Amino acid sequence: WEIDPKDLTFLKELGTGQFGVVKYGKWRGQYDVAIKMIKEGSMSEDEFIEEAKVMMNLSHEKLVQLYGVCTKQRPIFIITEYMANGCLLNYLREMRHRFQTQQLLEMCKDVCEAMEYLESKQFLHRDLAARNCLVNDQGVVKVSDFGLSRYVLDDEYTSSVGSKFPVRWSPPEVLMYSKFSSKSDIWAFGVLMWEIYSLGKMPYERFTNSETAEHIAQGLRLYRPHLASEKVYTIMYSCWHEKADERPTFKILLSNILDVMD
Numbered sequence: 001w002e003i004d005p006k007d008l009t010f011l012k013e014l015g016t017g018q019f020g021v022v023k024y025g026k027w028r029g030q031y032d033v034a035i036k037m038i039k040e041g042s043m044s045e046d047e048f049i050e051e052a053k054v055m056m057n058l059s060h061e062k063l064v065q066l067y068g069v070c071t072k073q074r075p076i077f078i079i080t081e082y083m084a085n086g087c088l089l090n091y092l093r094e095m096r097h098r099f100q101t102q103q104l105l106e107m108c109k110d111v112c113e114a115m116e117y118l119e120s121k122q123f124l125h126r127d128l129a130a131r132n133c134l135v136n137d138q139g140v141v142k143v144s145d146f147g148l149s150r151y152v153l154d155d156e157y158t159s160s161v162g163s164k165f166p167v168r169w170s171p172p173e174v175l176m177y178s179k180f181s182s183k184s185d186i187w188a189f190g191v192l193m194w195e196i197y198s199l200g201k202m203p204y205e206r207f208t209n210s211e212t213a214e215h216i217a218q219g220l221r222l223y224r225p226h227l228a229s230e231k232v233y234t235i236m237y238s239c240w241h242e243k244a245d246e247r248p249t250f251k252i253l254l255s256n257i258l259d260v261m262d
């Protein structure tokens with residue numbers, strides 16, 4: 001899994017993430033790569049390195065591939081597949097047109113295929129959201145940074161009352177009991193479907209976290225976006241059942257999305 005850093009050519013800045021600076025470059029003077037330059041103290045590096053092989057073996061066309069690591073210099077590097085059109089959240093917000101409903105469903109289908117693959121490997125994403133999905137040059141959506149949440153060293157992110165914790169993508173059992181399962185990714189996926197159909201709006205925009213939790217407890221959920229048909233809304237709504245066991249699997253959600261696609 002150890003990539004020779006001499007095989008990397010750093011070419012551009014690609015902004016920052018939870019682990020700091022990310023750059024764009026070439027691997028073997030030919031393949032586009034994103035290179036995460038891990039800020040010292042931001043990550044459980046040893047744990048990530050000892051568990052990374054699992055992640056490098058997660059290969060599906062709709063997952064942003066982890067290619068390898070460079071751990072013999074400061075900072076260490078995580079080398080991944082490069083996505084030409086950046087994160088899905090910015091893509092939805094910056095496009096000028098009102099997306100065709102078929103294209104929006106296609107984004108949902110792409111994410112659902114990646115998630116069905118992760119579910120088949122009993123591998124949780126833990127931070128599924130439009131900000132963690134990327135888009136390629138053909139408008140194909142891919143799921144990024146799956147499982148990396150586990151290696152974050154930052155209480156504002158890892159604590160359910162922290163400023164960076166994905167509260168609005170979390171089911172009640174995560175918020176009350178820290179109980180993660182395949183069903184917490186299902187809940188997050190429903191919120192992601194809502195982000196896609198609302199063209200990148202923040203979920204529960206008018207509510208504080210405590211108002212959101214009270215809205216949920218009373219049986220209220222995110223409203224049906226203008227672009228989502230009643231059938232599409234039934235799919236995202238099924239992800240938010242109060243009882244984790246009543247939520248569908250990604251295999252079932254994919255079958256539902258394909259039926260709506262016709």
Ligand SMILES: Cc1c(NC(=O)c2ccc(C(C)(C)C)cc2)cccc1-c1ncnc2[nH]c(-c3ccc(C(=O)N4CCN(C)CC4)cc3)cc12
Nearest residue numbers: 014015016017018022034082083084085086127145148149
């Ligand atoms: C994934 C990733 C992260 N994210 C992380 O490290 C990270 C995230 C979450 C976590 C936790 C789960 C632990 C919270 C950890 C780490 C951070 C910076 C870069 C990238 C990144 N990785 C791969 N490909 C990329 N492309 C871009 C990209 C950005 C902007 C443009 C752009 O300016 N335009 C304008 C022109 N228009 C035509 C196209 C778009 C293009 C490409 C970014 C990519």
